[PDB]
Each structure stands twice: as structure tokens, then as C-alpha cells.
Amino acid sequence: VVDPFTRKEWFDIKAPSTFENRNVGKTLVNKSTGLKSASDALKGRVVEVCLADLQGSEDHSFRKIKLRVDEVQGKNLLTNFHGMDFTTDKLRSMVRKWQTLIEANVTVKTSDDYVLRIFAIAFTRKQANQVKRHSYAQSSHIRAIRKVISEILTKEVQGSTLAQLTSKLIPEVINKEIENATKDIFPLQNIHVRKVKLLKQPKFDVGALMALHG
Amino acid sequence: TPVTLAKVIKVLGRTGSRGGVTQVRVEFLEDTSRTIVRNVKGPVRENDILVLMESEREARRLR
Amino acid sequence: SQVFGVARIYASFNDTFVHVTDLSGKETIARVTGGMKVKADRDESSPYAAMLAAQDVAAKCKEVGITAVHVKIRATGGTRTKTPGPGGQAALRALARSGLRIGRIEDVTPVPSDSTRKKGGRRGRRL
Amino acid sequence: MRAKWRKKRTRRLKRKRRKVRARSK
Amino acid sequence: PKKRASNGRNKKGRGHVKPVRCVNCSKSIPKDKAIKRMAIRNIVEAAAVRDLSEASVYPEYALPKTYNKLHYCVSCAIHARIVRVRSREDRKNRAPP
RNA sequence: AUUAUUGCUCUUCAACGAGGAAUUCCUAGUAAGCGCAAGUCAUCAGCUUGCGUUGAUUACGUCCCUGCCCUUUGUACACACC
RNA sequence: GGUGAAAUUCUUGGAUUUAUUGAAGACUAACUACUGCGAAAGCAUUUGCCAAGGACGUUUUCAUUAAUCAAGAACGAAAGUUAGGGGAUCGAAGAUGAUCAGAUACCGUCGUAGUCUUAACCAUAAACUAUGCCGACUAGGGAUCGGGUGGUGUUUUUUUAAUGACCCACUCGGCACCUUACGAGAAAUCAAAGUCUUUGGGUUCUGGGGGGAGUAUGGUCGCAAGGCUGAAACUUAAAGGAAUUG
Ligand SMILES: [Mg+2]
Ligand SMILES: [Mg+2]
Ligand SMILES: [Mg+2]
Ligand SMILES: [Mg+2]
Ligand SMILES: [Mg+2]
Ligand SMILES: [Mg+2]
Ligand SMILES: [Mg+2]
Ligand SMILES: [Mg+2]
Ligand SMILES: [Mg+2]
Ligand SMILES: [Mg+2]
Ligand SMILES: [Mg+2]
Ligand SMILES: [Mg+2]
Ligand SMILES: [Mg+2]
Ligand SMILES: [Mg+2]
Ligand SMILES: [Mg+2]
Ligand SMILES: [Mg+2]
Ligand SMILES: [Zn+2]
């Protein structure tokens, strides 16, 4: 004597700008009854979707993305950058035995006071013409590499908030430039920013929030 | 009904713990050059003719 | 094309769970598990009931508002088995065959930078 | 009987003669 | 008397390492003295590739497997998995397959 | 010859309408169906040992049950896991 | 939910399942290996500070300053003790559901102490390589960690280099594996367990059939639990080791 199916006021999710398709998907809410409606109550739900989906290309078949809902109008609600995380299976495949892992992170602030932390992971490359079955680093060299990753990472940010951050990650200049400064010290391969967590997002600023909506 | 006839090409062994089923690779005389392996029931030899019903569902090991 | 959803198959031992929800998550849509489509305690994780519940799941799924769905399968994890269960893929089989689309799937098993001492004792679980 | 428990066995007896002897002060 | 040159299992110049548990029975057991099976497997299985490609979008997809370390405890490592048992000489062989 | 050794004729006309869970035997003139001689024997074969008569179906395989043999392995047993 | 199977259990207290966010305390997965370091116990997230160490390099400096050790002392796993914090986890006792003839257990549930840290005790482990320390000599191999020497060697391009990783040769000091066995051993096996009746480099410790017994006694140490020192009467023909065949 219920069945909330024939009651579910439906809705559609839209994607941000600096990507490909701004059309994400479909959802389920409720009848916008007075006092606790379907208005400002829910909204802020967040979606995990691979960006090989929302971009269409397949050279991005891991780098999963987390989008947070902010504003909603005219049977339509957008979303801003809220997360980027790698996939279990991908690293599970990345971490192969007989080599040195390297991990580092750092807390940082963008121009528009979006406070977050970014990560970094890389593996010593077995150079060709090599005999030794394993190839390990030299700790001190690992100190060095982590140091430079820290420098570079805290250099790329403090630049036009999410928008530009995503604009630096999507084409991965970070990876290739870490690769650039790296090869002087020690081989190293893969090299992925792997993960970045938001923790202290600023205020609403609805106007400036409409910065990726044409 | 699209029943398709396939001739035994080789006898591959007995599967199933009981040891009755026989692994055999066949080729249908309905457009040749298209080998598919099946598992029988009764006794068989080379160059017999099995009525394969479905034409894309082959098998291998039993238990 | 179709309409995206999330399947979420927590199918470790002893049971088998399926429920599509909103791609954001805060809006679930139909569930049902393996212990419902048979009763025997011992038969609560078997691939059969898994198939049956995958049926009862896809059924209401394509009968409310979603006709396609990405999945994320998960073992117990934490400080437990971490290895997938009996009706793990047995439910995956009967939700693609049941005429519903699939779109990239992964593993949300909660592997830790391990700790919180496991159950059992240093002497194991002898029997 | 196990060497560990025979160790415990005497450790106990020893602890008891201890007590009995204490009566004599 | 003694019947293993690596005593229990490989550890030479340590005295202590660090114990870990058993994925089967949870028995604590030193890492050096464990037994490790790098467990790998597609999410699918035998006859499930067909229902993947046929009931999904994409071109050929990608099909991501799963890796996970398998730790066992000699007792459970003999109860089923890597063990059998070997002759006196069949014992010194460090050949996996 | 009663508690009826066996044989005969009349009369009497039972249960059993294919048999639960389980379980025995078997691969060709074999299975099964059919009778005879022989042992026992004064008399008494629904038994037995043999014999021929009629004469199929299904395998030609496997380790799932069972039983066993063989290796590696443990042993503090050797009067040998009673 | 839980196991072999079950029950104890949890479920308008919307439980298991889901999403979002927060806190607490442990912990350091994968990478992690016959790989490193420390006297031993032991020691793996990050960064900074603090003092230390070996191997190497060395046409530097002193010039016998050393070797091994009764007494004496430093540290010393886990539990355990005192006083605070901490108390997620897991979890001696205790209570329980099953299980069996019984089941004070094994399995499941509740869960105190405990686990973590600070200040102080305690001083034991199969604290194991069941193998004292320093020095010499005695035999082949490819490994691999650290240091060094060598190169019209490789891969890095900027214009050739300079670095860096890699290849190769050599020599130190390492964690070890391989084959041998001259030689050793009761054997298993041992590059020391070898250079031992053809018996002697230096030095410390312990053992002298089994049981009684690490018991009794004294002393000493500790808050306690206990630690070190540690007999005898009597008893007994074997205990015991490695290998062989069943
Ligand atoms: Mg008194
Ligand atoms: Mg032994
Ligand atoms: Mg030790
Ligand atoms: Mg019949
Ligand atoms: Mg007769
Ligand atoms: Mg008779
Ligand atoms: Mg033997
Ligand atoms: Mg780590
Ligand atoms: Mg507690
Ligand atoms: Mg109790
Ligand atoms: Mg008790
Ligand atoms: Mg001692
Ligand atoms: Mg040892
Ligand atoms: Mg040598
Ligand atoms: Mg006495
Ligand atoms: Mg006294
Ligand atoms: Zn185990």
C-alpha cells in the first residue's frame, strides 16, 4: 500500500565545462512538498564516474572522477570538481614485484582558496641492456625524487582553482615534467598524480560558481 | 529449426568422472573450414555425424 | 543511449547482495539478495539463489527507470577474506544475460594499510 | 606430562609450602 | 634431528622480522616463514566473456582483472594449496611452477 | 510314517494387480529363461556339482562411491595401532 | 549474522545493504626479496631536529696503546607489577549457544584484565645458527649489498661533453646460495663441525649414566609473581643420539 516508484520526481545530471560532454545522467528524488522539498535538501549528492566515459577517449580508462552537486535550476543541476582517484585494479597491476615503489603527497591551496591534498606514485624503470634481475633505488635518491615531486607539485597548483588544476591534470603536463626533472637522478616509470582530495572548499559565490556554464 | 550436422574429426578423450562422455572436435558439412569441439553421450568413432542444435556453444572439461 | 546506474555487488561468502542505485548513490533503487530465493541457511551463498536474485533485481530495475548499469563488486575485505565469494560472478552473469547493459566495472574491496588485529588468535582457528 | 606444566606443577607446590612455612613465625 | 637448511623458512641475519596472519584460518605466522601465492583473476571467469561483450557498450572494452596477495600458514598451506610433500632431495628444489 | 517321509484323485481357491529405503550377479553362446544326470539316498531336493537346450539389451569406458595395490612422508610403534 | 551443520544474536530500534560527513585509538598493506642495519633484544608512511656506527678511500696521526675474561655493569621480546592517561581493535578470566556418554575445551556469542603511551619495576624465551671470542692456514662457482679502481663500453643530446642509470673487468668488507670434499664425523652432515693418537696459536664458560630435582636448605634480589646461587638421602640398568629395516 505504498510503492514510492509512482512518486519519484525524476531528474538529470549535467557535467562541467573543461572536459567533453556536459551531460552526465539520470537520478531519483521526491515530490517538492512544502517544508523539506526536493529543493535545497538533497542537491549535494556526488557521483563517481570514469573520465574515459565523460570524455569518450580510452587513453583515460582509470582516472576516476568525483563530482559534487552545487546549484540546481530549470529541471537541471550542474556539478564542480570534487575528486580524482585511481582504480584498484590498475595499481594492483602497476605494483609489480622486483622493483622500488615511490610515494609522496602534499597539502596545497589554489588561488581561489580551494584547499586540497595531492598525491604521487612512481616505479624504478629497468633500463634496457641491464643484467640485474631486480633494479632497486638508493633511498637517498628516493629522498631526492620525493623532494622534487614535492617542489613541482606545490609549483603547479596555486593557479586558477579547480578549472586550471583540472586543465593541468587532464593533459598530464605534471607527469611528463616530473619525468623531465627525474631522469637526471634515477630511471623511474609510470609516474601518476594518482589521487587528489579536496578538504576545505570555500563559500558558494553563485556567480563565480557559474564559471563553467555556457 | 536450424539443426546443423557436423562430422567427427578426431577422438580427444573421455571427460566426466564417470568416463562416458567423449571430447571430440567436429566440422560441419554446412560450409566447411569451421571447427567446433563438442562432448558426446554414447559410443563413437571418426567420421560419424552429430546433430548439433545450437551452432555456437562448445564445451571442454566435465566433473 | 540508455540510462546509467550503479549495481554494487557485495557478494562475499554466506550471502549475495545486489542493488542498483543512483549514480550519485543517495537514491537507491531496488535490492533483494540470495537468502530470499531459497531457505536452508546452508544454501545462502550458492550461485543458484544468486542468479534468482539477480533476476528479481533486473526485473524491478527495468521496471522503474534504469535500463543500464555499471557494477562494482566487493568481497568482505577489512580484516577478512578479501577473496571474492561463491555467487560473486554468478550474479554478474544473470544481469547482463537478463538484457541489461554494462559500462566499465571495478573492485571496491576495502584493503587497508593493514591493521586492527584480525580475529582468531595467534594460534589460528584450529578445528 | 608436559615439561611446561610440570614446571607450573612445582612452581605451585613451591608456592604452597611457602605459605605453610609462613604459619611458623 | 634437523630436516631443513633454511630451518623453517628463509631468514638469515635477523632474529626478528614481523608476524602476519593466515587468509584461511588467521594463524599468526612470520612473513619470512609464510608462503605466498600472487592471486590474480579477471572479474569474469569461464563462459562470461560472451555475456560481457554482448551485453555492454564500448569497443572490446578493456576487462580489468584483480590482484591480491595470498598468505598461508604451513598448516593450511599443507591442508590444500602449495605443498604436496617431497623426497629428501625433492625438497631442496626452489623451482616454483 | 501320529507332529501328516514321498506319490495320486476329487473338493477348498488365500496373499500376491510389479513391490519403500536400500542391495546382490553379470560383458557372448556370456546374461537370463529351460530341463536332465550326478552327490546325499531304504524312502525325501524348493539344495548342490555338473551338463546340454532356447538365447538378447549395454560397455569396450572412467576414478564419483567402494575395496585394494604402489610410492613419497611421519613415527617415541618392532608383542609392531587389538 | 554465524559455521561442517546448527543455535546464541540483530531486525518500525527500518535492521544486513547504501550515500554523505565526523570523531577515537591502534597500525604501517601492496612494494617486501635466501635484501639492509644494530651487541643482543630488535628495527619498514612522511618530513625536521638530535647524537652515533661499519665497510671503503687514504705516501694523514699516535706507536703495542692489545686478546680473552671471576667479580662488577649497560641494554634486554612477550606476558606480568605500581601510578597516571588511553581504552578502536583484538582479547587470559568469567558468562554463555551448540557440540559429546562426559566437553570445565576445540567452534559461536557477550566480554573483564590485557593490548597503546608516560614515570618506575621485573630480567625471563626453542633470547636458536640448539654451533664462545681473537689470529693463522687449507677449494672451485655464479650470484648480490656497500666502498673503490679501471672504459676511443652501453643507453641518455644541446654542438661534443658534465652528471645520472646501465655494461664489463678487478679488489676490499658484507647477507647467503651452488658443486665439491682434500679433510672431519656415530652418523645426519660440516669451508668448519677442516688443518686431533702424526694428539700443543691465545683465552673465557659449561658437562662427567638415568631419576630423585632445579626439589630441599641457606644466602641474596623483587611490591608481588618470581630471578641468581643450589645439595642430599634413596632409587634405578639403562635413559639417550644418528642412521637401517619393517
Ligand atoms: Mg600465625
Ligand atoms: Mg623430527
Ligand atoms: Mg629471537
Ligand atoms: Mg520389476
Ligand atoms: Mg536327486
Ligand atoms: Mg545340503
Ligand atoms: Mg623412516
Ligand atoms: Mg608503505
Ligand atoms: Mg580494552
Ligand atoms: Mg570459559
Ligand atoms: Mg573454564
Ligand atoms: Mg636461560
Ligand atoms: Mg631457530
Ligand atoms: Mg670461496
Ligand atoms: Mg625433598
Ligand atoms: Mg629465608
Ligand atoms: Zn592457516
Tab-separated table of C-alpha atoms (C1' of nucleotides) in Angstrom, chain B residues 14 16-19 43, chain F residues 59-64:
chain	number	residue	atom	x	y	z
B	14	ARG	CA	36.912	-39.253	-22.106
B	16	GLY	CA	33.406	-36.594	-16.797
B	17	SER	CA	34.496	-38.543	-13.711
B	18	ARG	CA	32.275	-41.416	-14.796
B	19	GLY	CA	34.154	-41.643	-18.106
B	43	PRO	CA	29.903	-44.613	-28.192
F	59	A	C1'	30.174	-51.216	-22.267
F	60	C	C1'	34.699	-51.639	-24.502
F	61	G	C1'	34.953	-46.752	-20.838
F	62	U	C1'	36.418	-43.690	-16.026
F	63	C	C1'	38.306	-42.895	-10.885
F	64	C	C1'	32.427	-40.440	-8.387
